[PDB]
């Protein structure tokens, strides 16, 4: 069911924060553990601020904190070109339950279209289920990212789900879950943007985990 997939997502969601060495932590969004020490996380969380690799990355797992130099995480793209969401290996994180088999297969994408879905996410660790209207797939989606200084940049990815719904800051990194029980309520991808009552999630397929 949607609710049981949601529980599996919920257990693998951690809070992702960034800070300077010896500095305060800025808690930014969610990251989703997928298997072993690998997580999915929107790279817009860190990649557009100055000297990211000298920052410390922080992972909050139910009030137990793990930190690591940004230079010591291994970042792996999901596909060719910019897709925002990346895979990130964090050697210091406890092993996650493998949920990769709960992600949609590329060939089953048509089965999630025109049906409801649920965004399973948090705002700074408080779990929320957000209803999304019948899904569409945008071959190219564009959204505006506001950096820490206040200035904004425009970002564009391949293959993003679009659904009617109400999002809040900090919900990025949560998982979109199909209402379609005939594909076992597959995880469709990762929430990256919201606004004007529309929610956008990058498609993440099972096949993408073949990139380790």
């Amino acid at each position: 069911s949607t609710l049981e997939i949601a529980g599996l997502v919920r257990k693998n969601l951690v809070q992702f924060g960034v800070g300077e060495k010896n500095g305060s932590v800025r808690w930014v969004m969610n990251a989703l553990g997928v298997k072993d020490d690998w997580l999915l996380v929107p790279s817009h969380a860190y990649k557009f601020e100055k000297d990211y690799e000298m920052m410390e990355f922080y992972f909050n797992r139910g009030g137990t904190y793990y930190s690591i130099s940004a230079g010591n995480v291994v970042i792996q793209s999901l596909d060719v070109g910019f897709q925002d969401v990346v895979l990130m290996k964090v050697p210091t994180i406890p092993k996650f339950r493998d949920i990769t088999q709960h992600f949609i297969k590329k060939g089953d994408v048509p089965r999630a279209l025109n049906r409801l879905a649920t965004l399973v996410t948090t705002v700074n660790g408080t779990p929320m289920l957000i209803s999304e209207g019948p899904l569409k797939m945008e071959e190219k989606a564009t959204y505006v990212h506001k950096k820490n200084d206040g200035t904004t940049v425009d970002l564009t990815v391949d293959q993003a789900w679009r659904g009617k719904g109400e999002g809040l800051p900090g919900m990025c990194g949560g998982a979109l879950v199909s209402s379609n029980q005939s594909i076992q309520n597959a995880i469709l991808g990762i929430h990256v943007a919201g606004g004007n009552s529309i929610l956008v999630a990058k498609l993440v397929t099972q096949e993408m985990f073949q990139n380790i």
């Binding site: 929107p42 817009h44 989606a141 564009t142 959204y143 505006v144 990212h145 506001k146 970002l155 999002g167 809040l168 800051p169 900090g170 919900m171 990025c172 929430h191 990256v192 943007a193 919201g194 606004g195 004007n196 529309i198 956008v200």
Partner: peptide, 4 residues
């Protein structure tokens, strides 16, 4: 649409 905004980063959220």
């Amino acid at each position: 649409l905004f980063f959220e």
